[PDB]
Amino acid sequence: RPGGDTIFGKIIRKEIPAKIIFEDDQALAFHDISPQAPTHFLVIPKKHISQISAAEDADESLLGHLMIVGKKAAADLGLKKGYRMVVNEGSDGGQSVYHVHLHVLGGRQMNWPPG
């Protein structure tokens, strides 16, 4: 199915709404349901890539596009003092939903280590 078979596939197909902040032909950005910072949103590809370890070389431009969308949406939301981008891979990374998703977090100082 276009958009894949996870929670995110229903968002991509518009079956279930989300707090959408950016949309193009490649990607969607929307506010995260469990925010960990004053701004916390996800950027996802419309194409169903399960996890970053399943991305192929021909996906490079799309993966970079997720970062450029994250930069643009962070600017629209008025981040001026920066943000952190996070991609979780597999169990140790903390990934639960097996569709690639880039987190963008800002509006506070982000700490270290990053989890």
Bin 5: left if φ > 0, else alpha if -120 < ψ < 50, else beta: alpha
Is 105 a known ligand-binding residue? no
Size of the site for a copy of itself (CB under 8 A): 48
Q: Which of 5, 20, 75, 76 binds a copy of itself (CB under 8 A)?
A: 75
Q: Is 25 in the site for a copy of itself (CB under 8 A)?
A: no
Q: Is 65 known to be catalytic?
A: no
DSSP 2: T
Choose the stretch contacting a copy of itself; rule: CB under 8 A; options: 3-11, 17-25, 68-76: 68-76
Is 102 assigned a ligand-binding role in the annotation? yes
The residue written with tokens 């506070």 in the block is 108
Is 33 assigned a ligand-binding role in the annotation?
Answer: yes
Q: In 3D, which of 110, 54, 50 has the Cα closest to residue 84?
A: 110
User: Cis before residue 17, ω within 30 degrees of 0?
Assistant: no
Question: Of 7 and 55, which has the nearer Cβ to a copy of itself?
Answer: 55
Alpha-carbon distance 70 to 105, whole Å? 10
User: Which positions make up the binding site for AMP?
Assistant: 32-33, 88, 94-96, 101-103
Q: Which residues are marked as active site?
A: 101
